[PDB]
Amino acid sequence: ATVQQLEGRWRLVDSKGFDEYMKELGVGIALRKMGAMAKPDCIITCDGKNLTIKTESTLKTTQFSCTLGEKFEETTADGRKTQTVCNFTDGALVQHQEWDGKESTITRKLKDGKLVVECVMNNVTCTRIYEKVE
Ligand SMILES: CN1CC[C@H](C(=O)O)[C@@H](c2ccccc2)c2cc(Br)ccc21
Numbered sequence: 419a420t421v422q423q424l425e426g427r428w429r430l431v432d433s434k435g436f437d438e439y440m441k442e443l444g445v446g447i448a449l450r451k452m453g454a455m456a457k458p459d460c461i462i463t464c465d466g467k468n469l470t471i472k473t474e475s476t477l478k479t480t481q482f483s484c485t486l487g488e489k490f491e492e493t494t495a496d497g498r499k500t501q502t503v504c505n506f507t508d509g510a511l512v513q514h515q516e517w518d519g520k521e522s523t524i525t526r527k528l529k530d531g532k533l534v535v536e537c538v539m540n541n542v543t544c545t546r547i548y549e550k551v552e
Contacts, residue, residue, distance in 0.1 A: 419509030421464050421486070424526060428460045428533045428548035439537045439544035443522070445496045452477045453495075460533065460548055462511075462526070469504055469511075 440450045458475035472481040473495070480495045484504050492502040492515065500515040510527040522539040533548040 419528065421469070421506040421511060423528055424462045424511055424533065425464055426462065427551050428462070429551045430457050430459070430546060431532075431549050432547040433544065434546075435542070435544035436537075436546065438542055439539065440496070442539045442542035443496060443498075449496050459551070460535070462533075 436453060437450060440453055445453070456475040456477040458473045458478070461470075461472040461474060463470045467486045468483065469486055470481065470483040473479065478495060480493075482490075482492050482502075484490045484492075484502070487503065487505055489501055489503050492498075492500045494500060494515070498515075498517050500517040502513060502515050504511060504513045506512075510525045513524040513526075515522045515524070520539070522537065524538075525536045527534050527536075531550065533550070535544075535546040535548065537544040537546075
């Protein structure tokens, strides 16, 4: 498994636990409803150690870029400003966020040709499955 194999445009086909993960983050109702109903595409690009992830939908689009292994300020969809680090480790892209004494991890991995995105904060989890599209 390599970080490059995650590259491309992917479209959301299934979600579980997302609303509860947003509740654990303390996301307010406006943003939770938009999350309930955006069916985004996730676009992953990686050039050596440079990574960009763009999550795109008519409701909401976010994008960040980083260097793998280097701490950076991420503005999240819900407007947190986190200190994030992304690494490709044990065959998954692991995005670790720390802010105001709190932490959350988002992992992205290939499983059976699908992109599986898993979020966790304080044992509250979400799992989102994306299929590779043109
Ligand atoms: C870190 N991600 C992972 C989960 C979601 C995804 O990429 O499918 C993502 C998101 C972004 C734009 C539109 C809908 C959902 C999201 C939304 C939010 Br409100 C908080 C974190 C978060």
